[PDB]
From a paper:
Here we used a functional analysis approach, coupled to detailed biochemistry and structural biology, to reveal a pathway for the degradation of plant N-glycans encoded by the human gut microbiota. We describe the biochemical characterization of five CAZymes and two crystal structures to provide a degradation pathway for plant complex N-glycans encoded by the human gut microbiome. In this study we characterize the likely pathway for the degradation of plant N-glycans by a prominent member of the human gut microbiota. B035DRAFT_03340GH92 is then able to remove the α1,3-mannose, followed by B035DRAFT_00995GH3 to cleave the plant-specific β1,2-xylose, and B035DRAFT_02132GH29 to release the core α1,3-fucose, leaving a Manα1,6Manβ1,4GlcNacβ1,4GlcNac tetrasaccharide.
To investigate the structural basis for specificity in the Bacteroides PNGase enzymes from group 2, we solved the crystal structure for B035DRAFT_03341PNGase to 1.95 Å. The structure consists of two domains: the catalytic domain and an NBL domain, which are linked through a flexible α-helical linker. The catalytic domain consists of two eight-stranded anti-parallel β-sheets, which is a consistent structural feature of PNGase enzymes described so far. The active site residues that are key for activity in EMTypeII are conserved in B035DRAFT_03341PNGase, with G388 occupying a critical position to allow the accommodation of α1,3-fucose. The available space for this fucose is particularly apparent in comparison to PNGaseF/EMTypeI. In contrast, the α1,6-fucose points away from the active site, so is not an issue in terms of blocking activity, consistent with the biochemical data. The NBL domain in the B. massiliensis structure has a very similar fold to the one in EMTypeII and is unique to these two proteins. They consist of 11 β-sheets connected by short α-helical regions and disordered loops. Overall these data show that B035DRAFT_03341PNGase requires a core α1,3-fucose for optimal activity (i.e., plant N-glycans), but that the presence of an α1,6-fucose can be accommodated (activity against insect N-glycans).
Numbering used by the authors:
A (entry chain A): 25 to 68, 84 to 570
B (entry chain B): 27 to 69, 85 to 570
Write the structure that this text describes.
Amino acid sequence: QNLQKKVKNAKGIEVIYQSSYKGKIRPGQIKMTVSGNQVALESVDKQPVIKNYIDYAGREAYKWAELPDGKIISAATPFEFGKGFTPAGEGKHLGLNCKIARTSINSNTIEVWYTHDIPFRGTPQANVGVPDGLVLKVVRNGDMIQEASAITPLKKAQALLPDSWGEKMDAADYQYTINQSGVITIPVFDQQTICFNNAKLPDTLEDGITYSAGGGTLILKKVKLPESAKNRSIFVEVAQYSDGDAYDRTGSVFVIPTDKKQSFLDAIRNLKSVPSFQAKDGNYPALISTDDYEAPVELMRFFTGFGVRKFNHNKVKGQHWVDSVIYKSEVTPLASQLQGEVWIGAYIGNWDAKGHRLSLKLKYYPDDERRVNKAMPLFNTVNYLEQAGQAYPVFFLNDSLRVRFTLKEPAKNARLFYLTTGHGGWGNGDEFNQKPNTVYLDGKKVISFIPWRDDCGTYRNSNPCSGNFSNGLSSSDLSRSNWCPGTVTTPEYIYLGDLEAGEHTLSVRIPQGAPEGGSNSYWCISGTLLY
Amino acid sequence: LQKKVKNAKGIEVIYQSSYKGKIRPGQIKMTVSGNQVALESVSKQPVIKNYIDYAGREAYKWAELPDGKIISAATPFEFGKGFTPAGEGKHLGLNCKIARTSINSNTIEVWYTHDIPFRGTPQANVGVPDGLVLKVVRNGDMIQEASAITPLKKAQALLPDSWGEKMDAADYQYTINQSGVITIPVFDQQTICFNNAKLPDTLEDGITYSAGGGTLILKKVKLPESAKNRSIFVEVAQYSDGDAYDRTGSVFVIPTDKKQSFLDAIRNLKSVPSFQAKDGNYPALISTDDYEAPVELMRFFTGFGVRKFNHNKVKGQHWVDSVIYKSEVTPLASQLQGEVWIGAYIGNWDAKGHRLSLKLKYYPDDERRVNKAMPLFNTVNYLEQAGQAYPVFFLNDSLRVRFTLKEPAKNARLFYLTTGHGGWGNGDEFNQKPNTVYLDGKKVISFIPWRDDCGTYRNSNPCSGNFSNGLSSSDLSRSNWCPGTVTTPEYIYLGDLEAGEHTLSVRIPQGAPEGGSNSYWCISGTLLY
């Protein structure tokens, strides 16, 4: 390849850069067009158009973007040649002799190969520093490589800098603006009150309005979600603080599918109006999906700290309390329940007249091609209607939870999205004692495992009103059956294998601990089928 | 009771407590004379007493700490604070006003007589009426009530001789509360970095040594002789001193109950027995009859550049100044008694690296036997910076270990910490894979290690790379870990085991390499029995 001779007397060059990670060539490539002292760099539900430029005469490097809304933004960085660089030897690339310069940036070692063999300057990565030459290679940590694969002449001279810089920003504001540009954010609740105030669901529910229900401790809203959630990852974000309640409470975010005759809306209006799980104990309404009722789909199980923000005046040497707690979970596998117009709910079970303030948003982040699969709710024993007289799910003492479900088509590699916490807040109750959960499908044992968290001392600063014991521990510090005050309880993804069309049975056995002093143990388990 | 205490110069009230019907053991004796009240419990432990001065209108907490220290705290009160009338009642023949108040969520009613000229209460902190409190009712359910009232024919003075050291209430409570707590400081903002450090030949007690290329710090520490009747927590605090990345962290102890230990491996990797994979030999990862693998106490991951990169601006974020990690390790008690080598690892290649603190805490607990905890395996790459291979053998082999028990074991468990690694799109850091555990050739459990809450800890991650789709590296779901957080152990139930030989294996369908990118798994297991 006779590179120097081919681009002697060219009016400009086009360099194509490819990137590789430890040998493996990554997709997509950068075209760097050089003409005089100007450089343009380009690649090759609406995305910003992103470009980079350099002016070697004025010595500024530029980020540039046209946002979906057609606002132009840019950020300009002046540079000096060779800033932060230490000579680090010689090499050859595409037959051209290169100085190599080394710099380190945020712990990375970066080597920049650059030639003076041909009369053109440019670099694909100005942000690591700009050598006075044409950059043929950038090596990060010996492994991550962006290298010129080709250099070709341009016959015509050409101005490359854009028409406008539009709105000039510093680099951090620019990067944040472009990064968030393709993100859909659906605000749902913003510091909304959840409290016990006997509130009841109206007989008219309009779109976009918060309603309070199950005695105040459920808030519901019908929200317009993207039509399709394909090619997105989806996260739930909650922010909470106490507005008066001192205690660690059971929190849940859920959606209410209405694809059958009855939905959890019908249960919120009137618990006894929907089908029941029929335990040896008695009948427990609203907990299992059936042919004509869907249980609510849980998105996130969380537990409040003891009196966040509200009790920050408590003094405990060594502790510095937080002003609020956040919770963020990926819920991408529930995408099919998170498209179109959807009833969304949040729950914090409590008895306080002022209670808690909770925020909730959904974020949809652009992702590689990602099919929406299906998610079908099977069961949910969270006591969402505790403040409207729902029984505690105490039937595990003598019974398994049992469901039936039907598939129209076979499903490969099905999974149960399974949220479990144990409850019974004394020394022999299931909050504080390890118990297995055993899942059965179509008469076979799928898995037996113990739900347990032993990291709860980590979140001490989220718990200003946690009781301090005479042995030195705080209530919030204790290990518990799969939850910690102030944190998310993460789902288990239980592999079910391939399921044939037709009906199936599934059950959950938990050796729940016996009552004591009138107090009961109980389990809050939810399960959605992912297929 | 009236009748009997006309012209008494004082009274003794015995208070019993009850919970949901059930009368609690042992009781409170309240001595009242004049305007003074002394409270003591009716027969290691600090001595606790409470006083009231109705003349000065203060209530007092008082204690003698085991080590002969007297502390006290004074809280002025006003009569009837928080209190609203809630009617009439009778207790042991005396006419009571009932007052109501609420405190930190709770309902409290307080029955109090003026029928006899004595004032006192066993619970001044719920409020002090201008009479004698016969009954305190907290959420209808928590009850302290007078069982006996006895006259004193003579006056006494009841406040204590010394107040010792006078504190605010919160400083009092913290002081008494931490009285029985043993805290062993281990490391204090100690550097963990890559500086080619090597383990010395002379190793004294109570000193910090650097090893495995600088990324291991070790100390031999004097732990309680017995950890019976304690719950035990490990507390770590970390920040970057230069390293921008999310690193694998581990706190471990080195048992030396057998011929060779992990200390021999730290000094020289190839000096200890190996796991023999199809692939190759992997030293130090499995216990044998002459070698114990290190016992992991806690698996954690650092944020991306805590403290050091806090100058990074990301709208809506407010960075933490350090990250703490606290785990309960009570079931490893047997490895946390006597003289013990403790280590911390943060695998990194940085010249300055990290700073890490570590303490153990032993909190008094109800009767609790020390059980046993035997290490079986540990594939954390503790010696990464001294040339240890990545545990990549899962691609074609299971991890297998054999062990022998001398006696039957009831309700055995595997204390199992797993994380998956391989930090690209097709690597096991970011793809769900089962771990299947086998005992004596039978499947115990198959389960998917996964964390999908990592977005929660964004503020612990100032140097996390921000992608063009709006997510940050630290936000992504991963195989059982999040940058800035603890990975919690699985407790896998193995059942009763017979004395004699057993095998355990772990199968993981590890992803295939892509060029020089390899997936690998860091798994550790200690038998609890």
